Amino acid sequence: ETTDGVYRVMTRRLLGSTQVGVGVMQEGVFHTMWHVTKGAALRSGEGRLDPYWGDVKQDLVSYCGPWKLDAAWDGLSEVQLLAVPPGERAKNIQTLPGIFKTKDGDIGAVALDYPAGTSGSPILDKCGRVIGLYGNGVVIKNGSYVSAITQGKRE
Amino acid sequence: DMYIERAGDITWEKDAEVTGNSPRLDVALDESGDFSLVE
Ligand SMILES: N=C(N)N[C@H](CCCCNC(=O)[C@H](CCCCN)NC(=O)[C@H](CCCCN)NC(=O)Cc1cccc(CN)c1)C(N)=O
């Protein structure tokens, strides 16, 4: 099987080798954001990972099995974005999330700005659990970027 | 055609850099999965 951890999502269809995003391998399932893969199958060495679940509105997709990540921000504590920028080493950034207030409830949000290909980088709590994925967000009044902490549902 | 490459362990880093604000924003999520600001 393919090792737990954080992974770059790459394509060779564009110029050279391009990082289109990032995702999480946990419990045999690969987790990323829908807008990174559009639901397409993925190669892992000589193996193929087929899409299993996805939802455009949540902007999430899982491969090889159902969504496994179920930790949630506690609403109080600092978190760490494990940013994996294109062509750059994985790096942890600690931050206190803000909040997206919506008609259907509140979710945490991280005000950190990274290239588009960093989409899908995991956000972690102090126990190392993945509380969501980075890269679906807004540009606020001063022009800066704020990403939702996007988490799926574990069945 | 897309492929994945391992980039690291998922682990909390003890002495990580600390940055970023914590804005509270009214937002709307549309059917296409796009967030927009409410004002
Ligand atoms: N604009 C910034 N200062 N930073 C962003 C940081 C991107 C981090 C990864 N995430 C993305 O690439 C998603 C894909 C689409 C997901 C949609 N479900 N992107 C976004 O969330 C937002 C969505 C905004 C929704 C508003 N309703 N898009 C952008 O920002 C693009 C953008 C916007 C303004 C200016 C620039 C300057 N190049 C770039 C950037 N594009 O470099």
Please spell the DSSP secondary structure of A56-104, one letter per residue: TTTTEEEESSS--------SSS-EEEEE--TTS--EEEEE--EEEEETT
Q: Which of A145, A155, A83 is nearest to A113 (CA)?
A: A145
Contact by Cβ (8 Å): B10, A122: yes
Number of residues assigned to chain B: 39
Is residue A56 located within the same domain as residue A76?
Answer: no
- Distance of alpha carbon A8 from the chain centroid: 11
Q: Which residues of B touch A137 (CB under 8 A)?
A: 35
Q: Give the domain range for residue A56.
A: 1-69
Contact by Cβ (8 Å): B31, B19: no
For chain B, the domain total comes to 1
Instruction: Select from A69, A100, A117 the last residue of a domain.
Output: A69
Contact by Cβ (8 Å): A63, A49: yes
- Report the alpha-carbon angle A54-A31-A71, nearest 5: 105
Number of residues assigned to chain A: 155
A116 in contact with B at a CB cutoff of 8 Å? no
For chain A, the domain total comes to 2
A109 in contact with B at a CB cutoff of 8 Å? yes
Neighbour-count burial of A100, counting CB atoms closer than 10 A to its CB (0-12 exposed, 13-18 middle, 19+ buried): buried
Q: Give the domain range for residue B38.
A: 1-39
Q: Which residues of B touch A56 (CB under 8 A)?
A: 31-33
How far apart are alpha carbons B37 and B39 in whole angstroms? 6
Tell me which H or E stretch contains A35.
helix A34-37
Q: Strand, coil or helix: what is B29? A: strand
Is residue A78 located within the same domain as residue A65?
Answer: no
Is residue A61 located within the same domain as residue A124?
Answer: no
How far apart are alpha carbons B2 and A30 in whole angstroms? 13
Is the CB of A113 inside a 6 Å radius of any atom of ligand 1?
A: yes
Instruction: Select from A48, A69, A90 the last residue of a domain.
Output: A69
Experimental technique, in short, is X-ray
Ligand 1 atom nearest the C-alpha of A144 is 3
Contact by Cβ (8 Å): A140, A101: no
Contact partners, residue A23, CB within 8 Å, separation at least 6: A6, A7, A9, A30, A31, A32, A33, A36, A120, A133, B4
Token digits of residue A123: 């956000």
Q: Which residues of B touch A49 (CB under 8 A)?
A: 4
Catalytic residue list of A: 35, 59, 119
How far apart are alpha carbons B9 and A88 in whole angstroms? 15
Put simply, the answer to whether B10 touches A102 (Cβ < 8 Å) is no
Instruction: Select from A21, A40, A69 the last residue of a domain.
Output: A69
Is the CB of A54 inside a 6 Å radius of any atom of ligand 1?
A: no
- Report the alpha-carbon angle A22-A115-A145, nearest 5: 110
